[PDB]
């Protein structure tokens, strides 16, 4: 029963489908915005990282996935290296790949 005149944002339906998203670091990395990539990542997440070790490991896994995704392209690889270095981890797995 849609009593209220609904639209592209019916309040009950809007709750039924409220699915928001933030500009995840993939935006900068995939573009290739290194220093801004790390900095915005920290701005959003470093404080938000209630589990700094766990969150750091997860971000590293994401970084490795992203890097592996783009073997041929040069720019993506360079961005991957820089983001790994700014992360604080090893810089040989991605380079070896």
């Amino acid at each position: 029963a849609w009593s209220h005149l609904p639209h592209f944002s019916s309040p009950d339906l809007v709750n039924k489908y409220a699915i928001v998203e933030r500009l995840n670091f993939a935006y900068y990395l995939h573009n290739g915005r290194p220093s801004f990539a790390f900095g915005t990542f920290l701005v959003q997440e470093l404080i938000k990282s209630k589990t700094p070790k766990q969150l750091i490991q997860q971000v590293g896994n994401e970084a490795y996935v992203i890097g592996l995704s783009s073997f041929h392209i040069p720019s993506i690889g360079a961005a991957c290296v820089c983001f790994l270095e700014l992360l604080g981890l090893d810089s040989l797995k991605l380079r070896v790949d």
């Binding site: 849609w2 005149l5 609904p6 639209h7 592209f8 019916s10 339906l13 039924k16 489908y17």
Partner: protein, 68 residues
């Protein structure tokens, strides 16, 4: 009577446009003449009735299994 049926006619027209719209919508899920069939019938319908039908079409455009 006829004046009463005239109101019923727009409803009958609304009834006429009722079946065609869903039939186009019906097959379009599990997967066009039905769509125009309503739309053509919709070209020559009343004011409030046809506005309500258009709202229903918008809903059909903004519906899901729960809304189903």
């Amino acid at each position: 009577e006829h004046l009463s049926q005239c109101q019923n006619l727009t409803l009958y027209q609304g009834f006429c446009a009722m079946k065609y719209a869903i039939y186009a919508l019906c097959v379009n899920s599990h997967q066009s003449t039905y769509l125009a069939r309503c739309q053509q019938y919709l070209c020559s319908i009343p004011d409030s009735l046809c506005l309500e039908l258009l709202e229903n079409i918008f809903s059909l455009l903004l519906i899901t299994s729960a809304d189903l």
